Amino acid sequence: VSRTSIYYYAGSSRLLAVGNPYFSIKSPNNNKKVLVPKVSGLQYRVFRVRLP
Amino acid sequence: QVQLLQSGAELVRPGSSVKISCKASGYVFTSYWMHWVKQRPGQGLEWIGQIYPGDGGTHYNGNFRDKATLTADKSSSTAYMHLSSLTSEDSAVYFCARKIYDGYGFSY
């Protein structure tokens, strides 16, 4: 692999997240869909970027 | 979709005990206080109490004190009231009360 001097910036906007830090609350009837997702400091916040 | 089912008619004997219940769905039951009410025929409504399914913390009216035993159950998603030694002046209609999560007044 030989490298060229052509540089390209990229940048995302402010990704946000908000919810309950203890447990996910689901809909009472539909027992597969969430209502408020569970998010704390302790999760591995692993990202998955895509490139053109 | 939220709903409060209620059995419409109930025939009993004076001096006995009757188990009145209403069914809760469409929302999460442990996140709301529940109230019960009585409209005397030829009179306005009368508020009797205040009950939470989450802990079981009860509240009664002093004029209904020892007259109704507010208890519920969380598995079948219903709350109960149970009038003890019933007399003729409590021959009336009854609803169970649901407010908004804010809880100013009774929405459903």
Swiss-Prot record, chain A:
Coiled coil: none annotated. It comes from the Viruses. It is found in: Virion; Host nucleus. Belongs to the papillomaviridae L1 protein family. Forms an icosahedral capsid with a T=7 symmetry and a 50 nm diameter. The capsid is composed of 72 pentamers linked to each other by disulfide bonds and associated with L2 proteins. Binds to heparan sulfate proteoglycans on cell surface of basal layer keratinocytes to provide initial virion attachment. This binding mediates a conformational change in the virus capsid that facilitates efficient infection. The virion enters the host cell via endocytosis. During virus trafficking, L1 protein dissociates from the viral DNA and the genomic DNA is released to the host nucleus. Self-assembles into homopentamers. The capsid has an icosahedral symmetry and consists of 72 capsomers, with each capsomer being a pentamer of L1. Interacts with the minor capsid protein L2; this interaction is necessary for viral genome encapsidation. Interacts with protein E2; this interaction enhances E2-dependent replication and transcription activation. This is Major capsid protein L1.
